Scaffold this active site. Structure first.
Site, mmCIF file in Angstrom:
data_model
loop_
_atom_site.group_PDB
_atom_site.id
_atom_site.type_symbol
_atom_site.label_atom_id
_atom_site.label_comp_id
_atom_site.label_asym_id
_atom_site.label_seq_id
_atom_site.Cartn_x
_atom_site.Cartn_y
_atom_site.Cartn_z
ATOM 1 N N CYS A 155 13.790 -14.393 38.234
ATOM 2 C CA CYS A 155 12.488 -14.737 37.707
ATOM 3 C C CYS A 155 11.355 -14.266 38.590
ATOM 4 C CB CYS A 155 12.411 -16.241 37.482
ATOM 5 S SG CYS A 155 13.745 -16.835 36.412
ATOM 6 N N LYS A 158 8.474 -9.825 37.461
ATOM 7 C CA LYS A 158 7.618 -10.112 36.307
ATOM 8 C C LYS A 158 6.671 -8.926 36.086
ATOM 9 C CE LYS A 158 9.076 -14.314 35.371
ATOM 10 N NZ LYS A 158 8.365 -15.513 35.922
ATOM 11 N N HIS A 194 13.784 -12.487 32.342
ATOM 12 C CA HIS A 194 13.254 -12.607 30.990
ATOM 13 C C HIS A 194 12.747 -11.372 30.249
ATOM 14 C CE1 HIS A 194 13.806 -16.826 31.778
ATOM 15 N NE2 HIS A 194 13.087 -16.705 32.879
#
Ligand SMILES: CN(C)c1cccc2c(S(=O)(=O)NCCCCNC(=O)CCS)cccc12
Ligand SMILES: CN(C)c1cccc2c(S(=O)(=O)NCCCCNC(=O)CCS)cccc12
Ligand SMILES: [Zn+2]
Ligand SMILES: [Zn+2]
Ligand SMILES: [Zn+2]
Ligand SMILES: [Zn+2]
Lengths: 216, 216
Positions: A155, A158, A194
């Protein structure tokens, strides 16, 4: 809603994707890895739930690999959601000292084995854990697979936006992102938690997003 | 401060980059294209200034290319800065009616030639101008090169964030992005104005950014 996915990324390296419904985002995907080391399997991050973790573990055991353990990149449940299950099945779990400290404070079960420092060698020369410093969370660490030149950034990576800054350290993220970029600039593949798998350029994009983020 | 850059992107297609200092962003690059159609060159967006527009035109003139025209993707100066210089040398300048109307209200010199509609051919079947609808600005249009499957997204393509919203129509951007994506999902290369060249995925990212922006 969607079911757990397990796709081969490179020799001995698989990407496992689990899902969750997020405020305004809809069903958001979460990527982790399973690294094979001679009949031994290692989980890089666990799925959100015990269910998928069990599914993930069984997929590999039914294929001949012995689950040697899992290492979590940061404390949020999208990386640690399966520690509870693994521990109850006496499967070794690993998390940095900062991650276990954050987990305890959040009323979450901790990894059975913890570590600290800049580097941590889970499997000498095959699986290495690196701590670039605070960013997405105070504890986020990355996993470097030397032999494939693959970096699981979790995470912390990004490239398109920082995400929720609630538990983040936006003041230090840029510094951390800079150290990460210089340490793993030779990465062939960078795996975010993600968003799509990409190349070393996601290191740069993450840094620019952190800088942009702090400027605000 | 950095000097104008001219680099080949594909056959008959160059990317030109000019620079500006942008409040809280430092030196920010602006990309444009120069499309070659048999000994004739077409400018897709101009540099911020007259001296850079001159440098650009001369680079190609000194190579035997006649500057047949230039088209501006929107009214901001990073797309129209050189229209004045080009008109002074009788080089055909193009901009949509909306852009020309906004250029007038800005007290700026207008493109000699204006067009309208969802699609307009600057050069039939070779260079297409598409209007997805309001987004970054009320007038933003993109340029599509059929042969190489190259889309110049201009300032409307924002895969990493929308940027300043002062002149934007956030309520329509996502609708416009949807239309652009379904129309040019077959693009091989998508060139943004303020970030690296990518593939058809920048269209998707842009749409998601617009959506996120509208929600925020
Ligand atoms: C818009 N578009 C460019 C984007 C695509 C994919 C991911 C984006 C992210 S993200 O990479 O942040 N993922 C979305 C939020 C996931 C939220 N999950 C959690 O907070 C769980 C704990 S980490 C931030 C901004 C923008 C993202
Ligand atoms: C952080 N990082 C991922 C980014 C890289 C490149 C561009 C980004 C943009 S942007 O692509 O929006 N342009 C940056 C500001 C440009 C300023 N120039 C103008 O406003 C001139 C008028 S159009 C927004 C968010 C983030 C951007
Ligand atoms: Zn997290
Ligand atoms: Zn996450
Ligand atoms: Zn603009
Ligand atoms: Zn611009």
């Amino acid at each position: 809603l969607p079911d757990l996915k397990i796709e081969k990324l490179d020799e001995g390296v698989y990407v496992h994707t689990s899902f969750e419904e997020v405020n305004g985002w809809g069903v958001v995907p979460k990527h982790g890895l399973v690294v094979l080391v001679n009949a031994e399997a290692y989980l890089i991050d666990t799925p959100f739930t015990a269910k998928d973790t069990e599914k993930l573990v069984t997929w590999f055991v039914e294929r001949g690999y012995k689950i040697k353990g899992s290492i979590s990149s940061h404390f949020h449940s999208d990386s640690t959601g399966g520690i509870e299950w693994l521990n109850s099945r006496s499967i070794p779990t690993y998390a940095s000292e900062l991650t276990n400290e954050l987990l305890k404070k959040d009323g979450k079960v901790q990894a059975t084995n913890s570590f600290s420092g800049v580097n941590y060698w889970l499997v000498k020369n095959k699986i290495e854990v690196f701590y670039p410093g605070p960013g997405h969370t105070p504890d986020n660490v990355v996993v470097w697979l030397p032999e494939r030149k693959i970096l699981f950034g979790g995470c912390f990576i990004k490239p398109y936006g920082l995400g929720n800054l609630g538990d983040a350290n936006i003041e230090a993220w840029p510094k951390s992102a800079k150290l990460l970029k210089s340490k793993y600039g030779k990465a062939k593949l960078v795996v975010p938690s993600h968003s799509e798998v990409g190349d070393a350029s996601l290191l740069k994009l993450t840094l620019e997003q952190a800088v942009k983020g702090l400027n605000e």
